Design a protein around this nucleic acid. Structure first.
Lengths: 50, 39, 201, 68, 119, 240, 78, 98, 343
RNA sequence: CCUUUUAAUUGAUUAUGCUGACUUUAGUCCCGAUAAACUACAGUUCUGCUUAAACUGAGGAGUCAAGUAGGUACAAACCGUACAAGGAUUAAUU
């Protein structure tokens, strides 16, 4: 009675959660690397908007 | 080791089925005094 | 030979009863009963390869399926017997060429299926052994099988099985004299205790 | 008391507008029971909420029906 | 009598709720693409309006058979149309008069010792 | 009691502009703010008819001041609201949704039924133009222009009945004296859209869906309305 | 202050009728009118009675078959 | 449910300290570093208590030079020497006199 | 509420409700009510309802009183009931419920017999007649004063009208009356009565007692009471002729029926012909103007009471028969089964 | 039946009579102190008051009462509940 379906855990992804582990956003490796590349300009934009 | 005898084979036994419980529950007559006097 | 087939038939009965998820409607009942009948027919095929078809139980399953086939689609989508009118049951019996008694037997079978599904769900969630035969089922149902849900504001919970069982229980228990039953706070008849026979000896 | 020897029935002869529900305390107790069951893999709340004849394995429901 | 509103006997019907203001009979027909209606969309689909013609958000769709109506309900219940999932209901009786079987009304309503609800 | 005493005691009496809730004024204000926050979070609340009628005005005030987008109106909205979820929902969903709606962002619907437990008349209070609304919201702005244009073209009665309003709306062509042909010519960018001054094969490309983009993978979690739940009421036992 | 005599059966009957009319015209007529106007909308479905109630429905029955000119049921399919 | 519930009107469960928590015949909190226990452990057991830390309960280590709670990671009734000198404040009960 | 609503008083009025004024006004009202009737101008007979069981009981008791003996007694004499007696001197006679059952049997037999009588379409029968049920519910925790209100509400109404009435009130203790009404309606339907023409003809309240509880106060101890009452309702299935004369001629139509008609028309669940079909019963204005039209046609002798009654009865019966046939057909029944169902 | 007798303590509209039932007052008086939500795509309503640690070598600083007053399905039921070595060395089994 307790047997259930079989799924495939094969999609690597990063999860960002709040203090209570509630999910907020999921990013793949490509998005992560794009953010990493664009980081330096983001700091300048933060400074300018401050 | 021996304490199991308080429930083994009875309706409290968890390792046996209903038919076995009924079969174990069947019982005969009580010892009559006439036969008891011969022991 | 027959014992293995019967045990596997019971296992299939339970598993196929619990396969469906969500509400259990008359259509799901019909599908499950058809699966059971097909399993019996395949078992008969295996037996003859090396009689279920001629058994009264087999004929009764056929009659149940025939009665179900005369349910309207909305009745099949329903999941309780609350709104089946006596006229509707009579018309179903007329259309199926059967008896009101057999139609009510189909309804009672569905209600028993509902109760058994709830019981099996609870047992499975708590990881308790499921009874593996009719004897074990009957032995455990006298003390462990659920029968109702308690609701607020005094509203009534509908169980076709409980309605029938309570009606029968009241019919049996009615007018059972308390003349010789010792009741707290009632004076006893000592002479009648001395000469009237007592069946508990 | 259970033997009904006290005089607590005297106040119940007069109307009152309402009564405290002690929901904070009762919910703490209920969640303690739920945690005790859940550490062993039992969804007591789901069982209590199931409809008659309804079977739901795992943490499933109307949303599972919708997306499956 | 060709018009459905004129027929003494109506085909199997379904009732749709959740329709945005933009919804049109052609949109409903496209939503029901693949299912046999009782006629051309202008007759099979009838949006419900008030005295001023404002949409009510409710529609009546006629099908050629109860089997097709129930199949359409099963397939399209809670499916999306213009960003809002639509709810579908049968909208015809069985003739069995089930309303005669009313539930037993509580005789022990202890209001002051039960939880709050909007029953 | 006697029903005619209501007439007797209300002969020559004015209706109170504000319905007074139980408790002291600070408690009443706190209750109204809390229920406004909950209404923002839920898009609709089942209330008593008087309470819906009372909370409607504060909902309207919240939307009206949130739209203005000035420090003063922001502080007003802050004084009206309690929770970050309500703040986020308001500013990021209701304000863009009502960007072209001048006023009247809510509605009260009388259920025409008395509550079982205490015979309290019941109603709904809901924000307008949201999915699942009780009845469809009427259009505003260019969408309203298009609706009127379609009505004018549908029949001659519509043309006559909207003729004067159409002149102000700009749907009448002065050269020919008839209704314009290309209503799309009246399209203009709206505040709800993303200004384009900023001007597919990825394995994790988001999939289009009616309300929010969907991820191309599955996570075994119920929807947020079902993730965390508790018994609505734990029974309190009678002590005899 | 207390009554100086017992109110008679005649006057008690009069009071019964007067209070009946008062309650009628003050509560019961209004409640019945609201109840009958509520029929133009689908019946209320309490989410706290899901466990035992029927599935939500919109149709309201026509309860006098002798005045129904249309069809009562559809023929069985095949 | 086991002992996670009390099956009476008792609200707060009282349990005396366990035998391992006692001192005599109790578990020494530095015995895992001794030779004989490690000789007996073999490959069946790992005695380092750092391996039994529940990731979902413990907090990150703080800087000892900055304000932080003692209960987070110490779990004993004494002050580690690695925590800097602490200020002892004595109440001024008669400010008016001075 | 409206705060200006006109609340009625049965004994006083601004316009002047002295006893002479009441006499004059009620004479006017009686005249108007009588003139509201349209009567057939030709009938073959004036059959009147009689109750054989009641007549036989009356004659039995008259004989007992006149001769001091049971009918047929020649030696012994009648023995009245005394204290402690366990024998009922009138045990041979049927009980009230038995008489009701015999009335239903006689009504069924006369209904069957009328289907094979020539000139049955030109016979006047009058108000009384039809089957009668008496249903009782006990252990109601309400008093006489409230039960009188709740029963004065529903007396004389059609059963579904009464159920709607009592359901609209949102009173917890009216659930007892609602349960009684629902059970009675279900029972009559199962027995084969036409729910559409069952009315609440009368009620009866029977006290059972009152449970008393102490209430301790400053200087005395009081006793607060919880009532125990039973309610007996009399339901009557109107014969088709009475139903026609009530709904069609006098325009006394159940509001539940009218609401169902209006809901059907609003939802477009029926054809456009339904408007003229239901015009005689739909709304107050339509009913008034149809009554005026019928009065004018009768005074010009173009209206035919018997023909109109026959048309109404045939339409009603054919609608019911169609319901039965189509609900049978929805099950996939065979032609033989359907044909045999009509015998 | 009639007759004769009966010591029956034999006739009740009334003792602020006694034991009770049932009306009128009357559907009248009586309703204790602060409350909401449980969601068509994340969350943290507001208020009153503040001993809420439950091993860290230490029975966790008392007495008394409940003739078992916080167990248990929206139960004024049935069933169950005070272990002085605290028994699960259960880092086990799987």
């Amino acid at each position: 009675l307790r047997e259930t379906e079989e799924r495939s855990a094969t999609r690597t992804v990063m999860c960002v959660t709040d203090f209570a582990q509630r999910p907020l956003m999921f990013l793949g490796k490509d998005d992560f690397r794009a953010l990493r590349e664009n980081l330096p300009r983001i700091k300048e934009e933060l400074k300018a908007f401050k | 080791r021996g304490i199991d005898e308080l429930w083994k084979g009875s309706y409290l036994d968890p390792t046996i089925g209903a038919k076995q419980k009924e079969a174990n529950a069947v019982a005969g007559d009580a010892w009559p005094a006439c036969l008891l006097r011969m022991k | 030979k027959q014992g293995l087939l019967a045990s596997r038939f019971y296992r299939f009965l339970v598993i196929s009863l619990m396969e469906k998820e969500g509400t259990f409607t008359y259509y799901d009942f019909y599908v499950w009963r058809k699966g059971c009948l097909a399993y019996l027919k395949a078992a008969e095929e295996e037996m003859q390869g090396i009689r279920p078809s001629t058994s009264p139980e087999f004929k009764e399953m056929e009659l149940h399926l025939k009665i179900l086939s005369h349910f309207t689609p909305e009745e099949l989508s329903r999941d309780t017997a609350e709104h089946f009118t006596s006229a509707a049951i009579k018309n179903i019996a007329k259309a199926a060429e059967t008896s009101v008694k057999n139609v009510k037997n189909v309804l009672l079978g569905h209600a028993i299926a509902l109760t058994d599904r709830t019981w099996y769900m609870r047992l499975m969630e708590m990881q308790r052994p499921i009874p593996q035969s009719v004897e074990d089922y009957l032995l455990l149902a006298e003390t462990d099988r659920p029968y109702m849900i308690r609701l607020p504001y005094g509203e009534k919970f509908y169980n076709y099985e409980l309605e029938e069982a309570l009606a029968k229980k009241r019919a049996s228990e009615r007018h059972k004299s308390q003349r010789d039953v010792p009741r707290l706070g009632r004076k006893q008849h000592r002479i009648r205790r001395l000469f009237v026979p007592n069946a508990r000896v | 008391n259970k033997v009904r020897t006290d005089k607590k029935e005297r106040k119940r002869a007069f109307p009152q507008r309402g009564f405290w529900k002690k929901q904070n305390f009762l919910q703490v107790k209920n969640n303690t029971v739920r945690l005790a069951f859940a550490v062993q893999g039992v969804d007591l709340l789901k069982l209590k909420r199931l409809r008659w004849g309804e079977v739901r394995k795992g943490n499933t429901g109307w949303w599972t029906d919708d997306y499956r | 009598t060709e018009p459905i509103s004129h027929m003494q006997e109506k085909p199997a019907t379904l009732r749709l709720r959740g329709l945005p203001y933009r919804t049109t009979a052609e949109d409903i027909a496209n939503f029901f693409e693949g299912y046999s209606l009782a006629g051309p969309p202008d007759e099979a689909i009838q949006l419900h309006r008030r005295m001023d013609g404002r949409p009510t958000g409710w529609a009546s769709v006629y099908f050629e058979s109860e089997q097709e109506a129930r199949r359409a309900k099963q397939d399209k219940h809670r499916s999306y149309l213009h960003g809002r999932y639509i709810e579908i209901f049968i909208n015809f009786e069985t003739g069995e008069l089930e309303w005669i079987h009313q539930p037993q009304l509580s005789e022990n309503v202890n209001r002051k010792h039960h939880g709050k609800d909007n029953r | 009691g006697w029903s005619k005493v209501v007439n007797f005691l209300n002969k020559g009496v004015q209706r109170r502009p504000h319905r007074r809730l139980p408790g002291q004024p600070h408690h009443q204000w706190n209750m109204l703010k809390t229920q406004l926050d909950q209404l923002v979070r839920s898009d609709r609340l089942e209330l008593t008819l008087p309470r819906a009628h009372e909370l409607q005005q504060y909902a309207e005030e919240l939307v009206h001041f949130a739209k203005q987008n000035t420090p003063e109106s922001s502080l007003i909205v802050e004084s009206m609201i309690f929770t970050p979820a309500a703040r986020r929902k308001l500013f990021h969903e209701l304000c863009p949704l009502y960007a072209n709606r001048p006023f009247f962002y809510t509605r009260v619907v009388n259920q025409h039924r008395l509550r079982m437990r205490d015979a309290a008349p019941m109603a709904y209070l809901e924000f307008v133009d949201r999915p699942g609304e009780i009845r469809p919201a009427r259009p505003v702005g260019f969408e309203r222009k298009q609706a009127i244009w379609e009505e004018m073209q549908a029949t001659r009665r519509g043309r006559r009945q909207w003729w004067n309003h159409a002149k102000k709306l700009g749907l009448i062509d002065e050269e020919t004296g008839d209704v314009i042909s290309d209503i799309n010519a009246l399209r203009r960018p709206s505040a709800a859209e993303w200004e384009e001054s900023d001007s597919s094969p990825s394995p994790y490309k988001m999939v289009a869906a009616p309300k929010r983009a969907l991820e191309p993978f599955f996570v075994d979690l119920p929807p947020p309305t079902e993730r965390y739940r508790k018994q609505r009421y734990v029974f309190k036992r009678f002590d005899p | 202050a207390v009554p100086k005599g017992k109110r008679s059966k005649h006057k008690c009957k009069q009071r019964q009728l007067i209070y009946f009319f008062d309650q009628f015209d003050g509560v019961f007529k209004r409640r019945r009118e609201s109840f009958y106007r509520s029929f133009y909308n689908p019946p209320y479905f309490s989410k706290q009675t899901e466990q035992t109630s029927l599935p939500p429905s919109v149709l309201r029955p026509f309860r006098f078959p002798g005045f129904w000119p249309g069809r009562f049921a559809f023929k069985m399919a095949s | 449910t086991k002992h996670n519930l009390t099956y009476s009107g008792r609200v707060r469960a009282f349990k005396p300290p366990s035998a391992a928590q006692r001192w005599e015949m109790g578990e020494s909190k530095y015995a895992w570093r001794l030779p004989i226990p490690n000789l007996l452990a073999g490959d069946e057991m790992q005695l380092n208590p750092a391996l039994r830390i529940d990731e979902s309960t413990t907090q990150m280590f703080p800087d000892f030079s900055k304000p932080f709670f003692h209960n987070a990671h110490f779990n004993f009734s004494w002050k580690p020497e690695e925590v800097p000198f602490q200020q002892t404040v004595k109440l001024d009960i008669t400010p008016w006199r001075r | 509420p409206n705060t200006k609503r006109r609340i009625r008083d049965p004994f006083w009025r601004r316009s002047g409700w002295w006893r002479w004024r009441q006499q004059e006004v009620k004479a006017m009202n009686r005249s108007r009510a009588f003139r509201r009737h349209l009567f057939p101008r030709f009938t073959t007979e004036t059959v009147s309802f009689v109750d054989a069981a009641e007549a036989e009981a009356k004659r039995f008791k008259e004989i007992v009183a006149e001769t001091g003996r049971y009918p047929g007694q020649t030696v012994n004499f009648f023995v009245p009931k005394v204290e402690g007696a366990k024998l009922d001197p009138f045990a041979a006679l049927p009980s009230r419920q038995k008489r009701l059952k015999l009335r239903r049997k006689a009504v069924r037999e006369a209904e069957e017999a009328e289907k094979a009588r020539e000139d049955a379409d030109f016979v006047w029968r009058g108000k009384g007649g039809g089957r009668v049920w008496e249903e009782r519910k006990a252990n109601i925790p309400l008093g006489k004063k409230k039960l009188l209100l709740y029963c004065t509400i529903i007396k004389g109404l059609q059963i579904t009208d009464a159920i709607d009435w009592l359901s609209s009130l949102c009173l917890h203790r009216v659930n007892y009356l609602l349960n009684l009404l629902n059970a009675s309606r279900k029972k009559i339907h199962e027995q084969g009565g036409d729910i559409s023409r069952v009315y609440v003809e009368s009620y009866m309240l029977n006290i059972q007692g009152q449970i008393k509880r102490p209430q301790f106060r400053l200087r005395m101890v009081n006793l607060i009471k919880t009532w125990k009452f039973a309610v007996v309702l009399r339901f009557r299935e109107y014969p088709m002729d009475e139903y026609f004369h009530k709904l069609f001629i006098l325009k006394h139509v159940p509001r539940s029926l009218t609401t169902d008609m209006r809901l059907a028309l609003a939802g477009q669940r029926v054809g456009l012909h339904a408007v003229r079909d239901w015009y005689p019963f739909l709304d107050s204005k339509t009913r008034f103007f149809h009554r005026k039209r019928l009065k004018w046609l009768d005074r010009t002798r173009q209206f035919d009471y018997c023909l109109a009654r026959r048309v109404f009865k045939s339409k009603y019966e054919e609608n019911c028969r169609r319901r039965k046939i189509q609900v049978l057909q929805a099950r996939g029944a065979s032609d033989a089964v359907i044909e045999e169902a009509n015998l």
